[model samples]
Target: NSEFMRNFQKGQVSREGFKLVMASLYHIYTALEEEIERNKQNPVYAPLYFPEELHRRAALEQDMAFWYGPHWQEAIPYTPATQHYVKRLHEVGGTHPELLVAHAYTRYLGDLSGGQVLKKIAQKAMALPSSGEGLAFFTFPSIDNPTKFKQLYRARMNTLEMTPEVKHRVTEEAKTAFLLNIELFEELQALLTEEH
Candidate 1:
């Protein structure tokens, strides 16, 4: 009953839609990397801190440039959903650094988990080369063992030192992160209907 995914797989998701998706992802990933750097020194966040995600962002930017050409900024402006998503990430990173855990978990873990599947879909849908030319974002050049890395990530998540209230808040933030992502997908779907 995943409305976002259901819509994504129901029909032909257009190249424009896919490009918008990548553009939106760039905004969020950049914000996430900034948040990680901002909160890395916080003891509670140290375990969850992994510099590899920043590298992933670099790959994403490379792919973005390849797909949309060098002047991607003129082509890809942040949609409302993307703007809102970045705002939330900044808030968590700036004020409630502990809650950034929820965002980190939502994005990074999802990237490791379902991102691979999406990568293949994007390649086929966009008729992209399999050489990782416009798909470097999906290829984690640094992570040799995704399974082991995920295990470590989970252990870090499970061992977080937080009060019950903070934990509850973080959970709510995690849910919000998913909701924002779903909204972003919904927004992208609308692009298919727009008269470009």
Candidate 2:
């Protein structure tokens, strides 16, 4: 009874709604990858540095083109919610980078989990090709065993040498990430409703 996911699977949300979410994801992931690169070595942030799993941005961009065609840039505009999410990523990357782990964990792990189911729903809802043309974002070509991969990811996170204060901040930031996603979903749903 995941309400947002339930709506998607039931086609309460249309292909346009899905596309809007994809666009927002593109912006968000792109900003996150950039931030990771920019702050990977900053003092007080080295423990949170892990660039091994960020290879999906290229696939995400490819998915954008598959859905929106060559003019995807013009077709999918960033909503205010998306901008705010990216702004938060930047703020944390610059000032409190230990919290970036929250954003990374929230996104990448969620992508590996719920995102797999979402890809199937999207393919059926949109009548997508079985060849996986536009669904590259959900496909992890490198990782053959997602369970083991996630275990490693969690192990890395668990080993981070963080102060109690920093741990609290990361935990709060993770909660905020979920809240931000809900807001983004609501915003996209509103846009789809208005369009119709």
Candidate 3:
């Protein structure tokens, strides 16, 4: 059965917020799949803004392969509630890819035009110690090992080929990454009476 209706219809979340979050998840899940496909063909063709440029042509693809690779299967499971919600998100995303792109472009990528705001938030977040866990997803490969990773990413970026428009699209995707996380967090926060 569809996990979304299972939890939401069953009162895991109030009707209104649950509906909103479910919609958001649907958009995100589809986006993720499209990105995976895009990477498969030409990972570096459209690089993220401020992307590293010291690596080889295939470096980004190699990095992405590790991400969606076998290690992910060994990762810890989310709480039952989170899992149910995720399953629902997958259902929507598997069905509607375009809506997901629309949301990314409108809500997230657009927001990145003011990237200093996200950088400020990241600086504050990385300062705290506990950010390793909660912010693991937030931390980019470049931030953690800036000296090496930045150089390597720069090498990769240097090798990528793109038109001015494609470069703009890439930076927009990076902004979407920032905005989408806030949206995801807000969605989760509303579902719980209190976060632990």
Candidate 4:
């Protein structure tokens, strides 16, 4: 299902090309997650990023995962060729704190980025093709204005809830996460690059 990984393994992307991209994302996510925690003490709002509405809606989606949870282990029947790849992912480093934090932080990165991009596209007159149900994920009916939303977010960052040093640390951590992804892509380049 993830053709990009297949492409990389085939050497479609140069090592440098892959690394640079991964680095950038690892940086972004690492920073964002750190920021969320560091700013917990800021006054404007500690919980604006993950609004209550978003949490409730997202929880519903995650809950649906269990309905067919058992099937998750049923091999990649969705595509025979990639079955091993899927299984390998499942086997990577069982449940652990690092993995848990990494996953949780990444999910937040994804959710935030999706909303930001969709809003950007909407503003540029690029219509999103979807019935609300299809994109129930990005349908944040509450945000009326992008500028206002950002202002609110930044304003919430104005307090002593977090020390300047801690803020920086968290931001750096986010960057690390962003770059780590680039590293992962680069590391897997050989999988897709080796010509058959």
Quote each prediction's TM-score.
0.89, 0.88, 0.33, 0.40
Name the 10 consecutive residues with the lowest summed lDDT in model 3: 51-60
Q: Give me the displacement of residue 17 in model 2, in angstroms.
A: 1.0
**Cα deviation in Å at residue 146, candidate 3?**
6.1
Query: 49-93, model 2: which lDDT tens digit per residue?
Result: 556554468887888998788988778789999998999899987
The Cα local distance difference test for each model comes to 0.77, 0.77, 0.39, 0.38
The candidate with the higher lDDT, 2 or 4, is: 2
Ranking by TM-score: 1, 2, 4, 3
As a whole number from 0 to 100, the lDDT of residue 82 in candidate 3 is: 43
Residues 6-106 of candidate 4: C-alpha lDDT, one tens digit per residue: 45323344433333323322333333344444443433234354543333234223322322233422321122222322222233223211222233343
Error of 1 at 160 (Å): 1.5
Model 1 over residues 74-112: C-alpha lDDT tens digits?
Answer: 776788889999999999999998888888888877666
Q: In angstroms, how far off is 41's CA in candidate 4?
A: 9.0
lDDT of 3 by residue, 1-196 (tens): 2243334323354423432443333334333444434343333433432323221113223322333344522332233444443443344335532223333334323322333333344335334233332212223443444455435544655666656775665566445544444545454555455645
| TM-score, predicted candidate 1 vs. hidden true structure | 0.89
